[PDB]
Structure formats: structure tokens, C-alpha cells
Amino acid sequence: EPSQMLKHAVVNLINYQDDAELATRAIPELTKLLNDEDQVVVNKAAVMVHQLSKKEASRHAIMRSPQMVSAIVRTMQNTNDVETARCTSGTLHNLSHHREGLLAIFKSGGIPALVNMLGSPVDSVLFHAITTLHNLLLHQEGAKMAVRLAGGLQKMVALLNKTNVKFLAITTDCLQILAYGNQESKLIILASGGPQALVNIMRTYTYEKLLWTTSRVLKVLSVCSSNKPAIVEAGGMQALGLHLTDPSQRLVQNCLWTLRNLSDAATKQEGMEGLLGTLVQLLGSDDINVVTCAAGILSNLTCNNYKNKMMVCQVGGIEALVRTVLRAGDREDITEPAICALRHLTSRHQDAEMAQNAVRLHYGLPVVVKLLHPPSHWPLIKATVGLIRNLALCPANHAPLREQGAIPRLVQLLVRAHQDTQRRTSQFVEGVRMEEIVEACTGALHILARDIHNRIVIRGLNTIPLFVQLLYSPIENIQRVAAGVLCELAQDKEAAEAIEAEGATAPLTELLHSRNEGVATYAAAVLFRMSEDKPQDYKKRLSVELTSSL
Numbered sequence: 001e002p003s004q005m006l007k008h009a010v011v012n013l014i015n016y017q018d019d020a021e022l023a024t025r026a027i028p029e030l031t032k033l034l035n036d037e038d039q040v041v042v043n044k045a046a047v048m049v050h051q052l053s054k055k056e057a058s059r060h061a062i063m064r065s066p067q068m069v070s071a072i073v074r075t076m077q078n079t080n081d082v083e084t085a086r087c088t089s090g091t092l093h094n095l096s097h098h099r100e101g102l103l104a105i106f107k108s109g110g111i112p113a114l115v116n117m118l119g120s121p122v123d124s125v126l127f128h129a130i131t132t133l134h135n136l137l138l139h140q141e142g143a144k145m146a147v148r149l150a151g152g153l154q155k156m157v158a159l160l161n162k163t164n165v166k167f168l169a170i171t172t173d174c175l176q177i178l179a180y181g182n183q184e185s186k187l188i189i190l191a192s193g194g195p196q197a198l199v200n201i202m203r204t205y206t207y208e209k210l211l212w213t214t215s216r217v218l219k220v221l222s223v224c225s226s227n228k229p230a231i232v233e234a235g236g237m238q239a240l241g242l243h244l245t246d247p248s249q250r251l252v253q254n255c256l257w258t259l260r261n262l263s264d265a266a267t268k269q270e271g272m273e274g275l276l277g278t279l280v281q282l283l284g285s286d287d288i289n290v291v292t293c294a295a296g297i298l299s300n301l302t303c304n305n306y307k308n309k310m311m312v313c314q315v316g317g318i319e320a321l322v323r324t325v326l327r328a329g330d331r332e333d334i335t336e337p338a339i340c341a342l343r344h345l346t347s348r349h350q351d352a353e354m355a356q357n358a359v360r361l362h363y364g365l366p367v368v369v370k371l372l373h374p375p376s377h378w379p380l381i382k383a384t385v386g387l388i389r390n391l392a393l394c395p396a397n398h399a400p401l402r403e404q405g406a407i408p409r410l411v412q413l414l415v416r417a418h419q420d421t422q423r424r425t426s427q428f429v430e431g432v433r434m435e436e437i438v439e440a441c442t443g444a445l446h447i448l449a450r451d452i453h454n455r456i457v458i459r460g461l462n463t464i465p466l467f468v469q470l471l472y473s474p475i476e477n478i479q480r481v482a483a484g485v486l487c488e489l490a491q492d493k494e495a496a497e498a499i500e501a502e503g504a505t506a507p508l509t510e511l512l513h514s515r516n517e518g519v520a521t522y523a524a525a526v527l528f529r530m531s532e533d534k535p536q537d538y539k540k541r542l543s544v545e546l547t548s549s550l
Contacts, residue, residue: 020057027061027068034071042075043084050087053094062091063101070108077113085125089117093128096135105132106140115150118159126159130170137177144178153178153185157192160200165207172198172210176217186224189217195227196234203239208248215240215254222261229265231258237266241275244282256282256293263300267308276301276311283320288334295324295337302341306349313351318342318358326367332380335371339383342368346390356394359387365397369404372413378432385410385440389447398451407445407454411461414441418466435475442470443481449488459489464498471507471523476516483511483522490529500530512549520550 001007030052033045049072052058062068076088092110095101105111110132117129133152136143147153152174159171175194179185189195194217201214218236221227240255259275266272279301282294298317301308311317321338328334342364345355359365368391371384388406391397417437420427427433445463449455467489470482486504489495504526511523524546531542 016057018057019055020061023052023055023058023061026052027065031065031068031071034075039081042079043081046072046075046079046084046087046091050091050094053091059094059098060100063095063098063104066104066107069095069104069110073105073108073110073113077116082122082125085117085120085122086128089114089125089128089132093132096132099139102136102140102143106136106143106146111136111143111146111152112150115147115152115155118152118155123164126162127167130156130159130167130174134170134174137174147178148182148185153188154192157189157194157197160194160197165205165210168201168205169207169210169213172201172213172217176213176220179217179220183224186221186227189221190224190227190230195221195230195236199231199234199236199239202236203242208246208251211243211246212248212251212254215243215251215258219254219258219261222258228262232262232266232269235269235271237262237269237275238271241278244275244278249287253289253293256290256297260293260296260300263297264303266301267303267305270307272301272308273311276308277315280312280315280317280320283324288331291324291327292334292337295321295334295341299337299341299344302344304344304348309345309349310351312341312345313355313358317345318355318364319362321345322359322362322364322367325364325371330375332377336380336383339368339371339380339387343383343387343390346387347393352390353394356391357396359391360394360397360400365391365400365404369401369406369409372406372409378430378437381413382432382436382440385413385437385444389440389444392444392448392450395450398448398454401448402451402454402457407448407457408461410441410444410448411458411463413437414445414463415466417441418470435478438470438473439475439477439481442467442478442485446481446484446488449485452492455489455492455495458485459495459498464489464495465502468499468502468504468507471504471511476514476519479511479514480516480518480522483508483519483526487522487525487529490526493533496529496532499526505530509545512546524550 001011030045030049034042036042049062053062072088072091076085076092079085079088092105095105114129114133117125120126120129133147137147156171156174160168162168175189179189198214198217202211205211218231218240221231237259240259243251243255246252279294279298282290285291285294298312302312321341324338325335328338342359346352346359359368368384368387371380376384388401392401417434420434421438445458449458467482467485470478473479473482486499490499508523508527512520514520514523527542531539
């Protein structure tokens, strides 16, 4: 022994087959001792069988006896002695560490009993209990399908109230292995209060391995249209946001994904300061994923929510995003969400006008109008056109935006997109249907037509004839922006008569009976401009026409 392994071998071999055969000679007996009625007798047996599992030799023996196993399982779920349980359970634990054992316990029906063991008030018991289950869920085939039917989920979620970190991890991981790619399970975890339970963990412990394992569960639930809003109410967003800076990259990445899967719902949450603020930071991270997800989340959280829009602006959201776009490049996987954010951050909220100037002070206009041209794809373009529009609300961008050659492109896109909606008659593309490109562009020109010089350019491209045709569109929104752009242009005699000679008088006169506050207005607006400076006769019947018909 104190020499080499040449001696240890004869020892390991002499005692292995030794204690090994001892079991094959006692297993049958002990088996009976368990089935025995006398309670005190079974107890002793359980303690002996457990002392045998410890030994490898004896272990395989117990692990190969379908009768001995089934006996242990049975005894464990029917025993009312804290020691018999901890031993019977502990035994099954030392057995699960082996493929044969798992198969055995699985064949002897241990999962069910084990599940029922999770309800046990005894700690040690619960430990070995959940553990053995974890092993079966990882290596035992069909084990999953089984645990579910045994109502483990609920019992497992209930255990989430414990305090042992390393224990919580094991349990949570189970809730993960059972939920992944399974709606039923996910629903059950929902009908068990899992969400609020899980969240509490993320907002209470610091055990890295736990948080991760916990977030994972949330990730698999964030995909569910049922748990998604549920995870939100519990305040999951805020919770997850409390780890976006953690050193464990895997933890941060998981929190990010889960967030993006809930962002399109938490648009009505309060106390997002930390999150929103932190997300802005991530926009400056080195990892593309971090930046992307960061952008995506912001984009969603900034969609219709002034409280969020203003905050993002009070943390450098614009500058941050502007750099994100100027950093992304062609990777529309980053520009699209980034641009959308800016769009949301440039409309419907006090500090809107602020950001509008911001996008310019940080040299964003050049890169914004830039995205209007190839290789940029329709989805990006649509989102971009929207941004430009709002950016046009600020007269300080009129000139700077016009110099970037935005009007020419917008008009062009309008033409083609429109000519496309015309050939579709005698209609989606990459997801974005041209009809949407028409409204945006025109609407972008309507707002951008507030500058005299811009109007000279817009008109110069001979667009008057087209905008008139759009008045015949079956889509209100198009008519609105259509009659709108004509309105801003109608304030100039030349363009005024230009629109009249185009035959806009007839159609416009009708849009007065439109069930759209705007349409009618703009429509009437152009009419007035045209007839302005005509015989005192027509303009008189004109003033009546407007007062009577509306």
C-alpha cells in the first residue's frame, strides 16, 4: 500500500468483490425487512441499505435489483419517520449518480414519490429529493414527461420560498428544464405564482449561479404571451435591470434578452429610472449584442410613454443613440431599433423639441438622411423617414436637413413606392407595404414644407401633379398628408395656381365632406388660397361653401 498502485489494486480488488458479494447475499433479506410491517424493523433496514449505497460494490448490487429499488421508493413515500425518509431519500440520491440507478428509480416509480417528497417539511430530505429529481431531469429519458404528470412544477415553485441559495438554484434549474419548449409547464408555473416568486429572488440574493439560473427561467417565460405580462406586473423589468452591470456576462446577457421580450409590454410601468438610465449606458458597451439589445429595449420602452422619453433625454439618450447609429454602420440590426428610439424621442412629450435640436447638435442629420439611401432596407427606411419628419418639426433643422438632400430622396421614394401601389392594382415588401412609405414620405414633406426654400425645392421636383393624385387615395392618412403638403405650398401664388390648373379644385372641394378634422381643414385651406384674388363673386360663394357644407 505504501509503495505503488500495484498493491492498491490487489486491495481495491480484494475488498470490492468482497463487499460486492456481501450485498448480493444481504440485499434479498433487507428487501424483506423494508416490506415488513413492524415499523421499527423497516427503519433499521433503511439505515442498513443506505449504508450499503455508500459502498460502490454494494451500490451496483442495490442498483441492479428492481425489487430492492421499488421497495426503497415505496418505503420512502409511505414512511412517517424523519430518519427513514432522509435515509430512503438519501439512498436514492447515491443511486441517481449512476445511469443504471436513474433507470432503476425511473422504472420503480420514484419520480412520483420524490415529487411528493418535495412537500416534506424536513430540509435534508428536500435536498436529496430535489437533487435526485434534477439528475433524472438531466439524464433520465422520459423523466421530464413523468415529473410533469406528478405535479412537480407546483411543488417545485412552492419551494422557491426557501433561503438556501444552492438549493434555490437546483430547484429553479428544474423549473427551467421543465418549462423550456413546453407551454403547459410554463402555464402551470404561472398558475403557481412562479413569476412573482422568481422576481423576488432576482431582487433579494446575490449568489451569481442562482440569479443566472433564475433569469433563465424568466427567459423561457418571457416568450409566453401569458407569462410575459405576468413577469411585468411583478416588476421583473426593474428586477432584471438590477444586474445589467454584473460581472457575470452570461447573467447580464440573459437579463437583456428577457427584457426585450417584456419591453413591448412594460410600456406602462413606473420606476424605470434605473433601468432606462442603465440601458443608455450599455449603448456605449463594446459587445455588439449588449448595444443591440440595449437599443431594442429602449426603442420599446420609449414607444408611447412621455415619462420614459423625457428621462432618456435627461440621460443623454439622444447623443448616446446618435452615436449608436453612427457606430452601427450598415448593420441595420442596430440602426433600426436605434432610429425608432430617436423617432419616439422626438415627438409627443415636453422635451421633444429639445431632442429635435439635439439630433443635430451631435451631428446626426448627416447620418440620418444617409440611411434613406441603399443598401438600407425598407424597414429601416420607414423608421428613418419617420425620424426625419419629427426632426422637421424644428425649424432649426429645415436648412441643415435640406442641405443633406433629403427632399430629393423623400420625393423619389414617394414616387417609386407610389408607382408601385399603382402597378399593384392592374401588396407587401420585406414586411413594409409601400402604402406606408407613401404616407411617411408625404407626411415628412408636409412638415418639411414649412420653410419657404424647402417649398421651392419640393415644388421644383415637379411634385404638385402627384400630390394632387394622392387626394384620390382610399387611405385617409395619405389624403391628410397629401392635402397637407398642398396647403403649405398653396400659400404661394405661383404654386397656388399651379395646383389649381392641375385640377385640384374639383377634388379638394369634396374633401370638405371628409370625416377627418384634418383632411377637411387642409382641403379647405388649399381652396381658399387658390380662389384668393379671384372675382369678388366666386370667393363670396366660396366663403359660404365652407361655412355651409361644414
